[PDB]
Design a protein around this ligand. Structure first.
Ligand SMILES: [Mg+2]
Ligand SMILES: [Mg+2]
Ligand SMILES: [Mg+2]
Ligand SMILES: [Mg+2]
Ligand SMILES: [Mg+2]
Ligand SMILES: [Mg+2]
Ligand SMILES: [Mg+2]
Ligand SMILES: [Mg+2]
Ligand SMILES: [Mg+2]
Ligand SMILES: [Mg+2]
Ligand SMILES: [Mg+2]
Ligand SMILES: [Mg+2]
Ligand SMILES: [Mg+2]
Ligand SMILES: [Mg+2]
Ligand SMILES: [Mg+2]
Ligand SMILES: [Mg+2]
Ligand SMILES: [Mg+2]
Ligand SMILES: [Mg+2]
Ligand SMILES: [Mg+2]
Ligand SMILES: [Mg+2]
Ligand SMILES: [Mg+2]
Ligand SMILES: [Mg+2]
Ligand SMILES: [Mg+2]
Ligand SMILES: [Mg+2]
Lengths: 50, 77
RNA sequence: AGCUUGACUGCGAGCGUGACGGCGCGAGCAGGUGCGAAAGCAGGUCAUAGUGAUCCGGUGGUUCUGAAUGGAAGGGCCAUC
RNA sequence: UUGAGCCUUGAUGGAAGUGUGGACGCCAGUCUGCAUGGCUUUAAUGUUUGAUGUUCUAACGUUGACCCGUAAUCCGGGUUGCGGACAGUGUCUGGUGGGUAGUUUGACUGGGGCGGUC
RNA sequence: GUUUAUUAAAAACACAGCACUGUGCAAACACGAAAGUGGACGUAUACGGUGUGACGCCUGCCCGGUGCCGGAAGGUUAAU
RNA sequence: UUUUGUAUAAUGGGUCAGCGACUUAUAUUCUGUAGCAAGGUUAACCGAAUAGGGGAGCCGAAGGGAAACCGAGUCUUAACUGGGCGUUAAGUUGCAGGGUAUAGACCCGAAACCCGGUGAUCUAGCCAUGGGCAGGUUGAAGGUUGGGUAACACUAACUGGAGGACCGAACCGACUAAUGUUGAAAAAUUAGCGGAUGACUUGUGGCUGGGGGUGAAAGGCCAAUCAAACCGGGAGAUAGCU
RNA sequence: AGGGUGACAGCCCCGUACACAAAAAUGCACAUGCUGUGAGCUCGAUGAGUAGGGCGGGACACGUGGUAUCCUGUCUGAAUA
RNA sequence: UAAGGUGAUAUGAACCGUUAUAACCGGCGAUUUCCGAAUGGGGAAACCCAGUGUGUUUCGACACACUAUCAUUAACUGAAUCCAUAGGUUAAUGAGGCGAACCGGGGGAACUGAAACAUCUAAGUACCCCGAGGAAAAGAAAUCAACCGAGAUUCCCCCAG
């Protein structure tokens, strides 16, 4: 569960980095709260074009 | 029933075995939980009775796919 | 009492004794050894009690076996627990 | 607060003047710095990682309250208060476990038991 | 008062009274793989369990054993 | 029949008739017999279907050694004067029979264990809704009025009508006896007996299920069955016993 | 073949061998109509919470045994010609 | 197809037929009360009671038809919440129940054997359950082989107790 960010956020905030977050942190808060999204190897290209 | 809506995991029967190998019937049943999942693609939460792994699948494949299944298969949800 | 390792390894004509598993006695042959000047004697103790099948497993040895082939695991055999 | 590695805040294969506590220093260096002068133990900043303590909400609980389905003490959805990474559950695991189950508990013998014997 | 319908009606069981003990409520506890239900539309003057058995006068010593309650030290100890 | 031994007063049989217990299949070995012979024979299958085809294969002609391997020898040991097992006699396939193996394996018989069902029309307890208790006693609290107290206390009458209270029918029980015991009756009759406004008794209907129910507790009751109900099943359980 | 007929029937009866028969409805084959369906060539693509592993069981003739292999309740988790 | 028929116990009555509408046999139709999956609600099976539609030169009350549930699809409706969902009505399809074995799947005993008994056996048997077909299942190598080769699955005989 690496995911890519969206806004700032915690000791990793950056509007679009590849972090390595704990899954529960990921699929219970950030994504449902729209602060990140999974890095599904398709996603590692849209925020790897900027 | 204790069936994982994602994997179809259900209880399975096996044995106990003592140090003397006495067999006593028993069941392994799955690590169910039931969990509010955000879809966004429907602006709603859906509670699936899900196994860990069921979760780990949802993590990987991603919810909507999994939801294509279930619906593809007829699961209520 | 002196010197000593025959309380030796491989075998064994022929016997005794057991329902059987087994146990016992044994000259002699081969190799190597001790004591004796030598003929000789010694394969434990004057003899008859001092004991535990098989299985499972340990150890040492062993080119005997080695699931395509080379090895290895595992097995066998010999010794022993 | 705090266990422990690599990066990091520690060390190694403008001269000389005024010169004063500490050094695991068997058993106390008129020597160095304070303003000025032609790829580590003595411990601590960034981390990947345990133990404990506080705080938070966002999984999870709610056999509080209100709302709708709905004239419904079921269920669900919703709002909210409470609880909160606990509780509970799955797999694994040490303890306990006549609550429950399956069984064992020798033979001889001047009947059997007790004794004795094997 | 109750009991072995059909060889035992009693000194047995029950009983009110007594004591210990559990239980803060989503109670302990019981039926139940679970949902749930009883306990109770009760809440410690309540409820379960256990022993004793109206009343009167009373109920002494022993915690070494077994059990239970308490015990943030240390020794031994599972998966991992 | 069983026994050391039975007229035995030890078993079994009232009598007759019918039925009633060593089978079947597949393996293996021996005997007989048949075929062929250092060879014998095919299995499935094909099939002009008991033929014919099919020799996959099985047995035998070589043994010894754990084995590599060697071979009329081989193993043992450095090696046998040796020793162990072998070298000399024929095998094989049918058919009938004797044994054995696997099967219910000669026939009948348990007490039980497991599985799925059917039972609270009896009885136990509980839930709901309806019914019953002739007649006669006792006289609790309370009340009233006099007496009595400073007022209460207290006291006498009268009134009142308490109780798992009293005597006693219906009703509910079941202490004694006799009768009955192939009964009138698979638990009753007669004479006595207990309770009889209560933890009473009763009609209807409901709920609880088998290691489960229910139990004022006897292991009681759960349909004349109870230290684990009944029906069907595993099932021909197993029976070193009769 | 067989049955029947007053007892045992090739020739009494009903059959049997043999040869024939379907107005209608149907099984089965083909042949087409209608519906639904896709064929073909070029260039591509090649099955991840999976394989494997840890724990617990179960399957494989195989009882954890030196135990390959298969399945998975549980926690994990690749390479990609 | 036909000279005889109106099933049997089963006579009798009254009939019907003989050259083709007697009977009898076959194909296809028609009718087909009530209960039963039972399906309009209920229920002590074969009974009680409805809503709505139809129906009467005697247009009342009765008779008939339809109204179960679930699934799929559509349409129309439509909360908390405006969107949107859940919810609700209608409609079209299909399902439901029964049935001998064979078949695949979810569960799964004990007696018994071991001359006792735990491992082991009985045995993945008996039994319960779900599902399907005319057969089921299995199947087009991440299979064997052993350096030579074979070439999906299934069944039979060997290999071999
Ligand atoms: Mg290999
Ligand atoms: Mg026991
Ligand atoms: Mg037993
Ligand atoms: Mg004895
Ligand atoms: Mg009695
Ligand atoms: Mg009595
Ligand atoms: Mg108390
Ligand atoms: Mg007493
Ligand atoms: Mg006698
Ligand atoms: Mg005799
Ligand atoms: Mg006589
Ligand atoms: Mg006589
Ligand atoms: Mg006699
Ligand atoms: Mg009753
Ligand atoms: Mg009385
Ligand atoms: Mg009386
Ligand atoms: Mg009875
Ligand atoms: Mg029997
Ligand atoms: Mg049996
Ligand atoms: Mg592929
Ligand atoms: Mg009806
Ligand atoms: Mg109905
Ligand atoms: Mg036995
Ligand atoms: Mg090749």
């Amino acid at each position: 569960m690496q995911v890519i960010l969206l806004d700032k956020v915690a000791n990793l905030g950056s509007l679009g980095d590849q972090v390595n977050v704990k899954a529960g942190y990921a699929r219970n808060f950030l994504v449902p709260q729209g602060k990140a999204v999974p890095a599904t190897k398709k996603n590692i290209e849209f925020f790897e074009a900027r | 029933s204790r069936v994982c809506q994602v994997t179809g995991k259900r209880p399975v029967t096996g044995n106990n075995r003592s140090h003397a190998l006495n067999a006593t019937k028993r069941r392994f049943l799955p690590n169910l939980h039931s969990h509010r999942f955000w879809v966004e693609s429907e602006k709603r939460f859906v509670t699936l009775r899900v196994s860990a792994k069921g979760m780990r699948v949802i993590d990987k494949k991603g919810i909507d796919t999994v939801l294509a299944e279930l619906r593809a298969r007829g699961e209520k949800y």
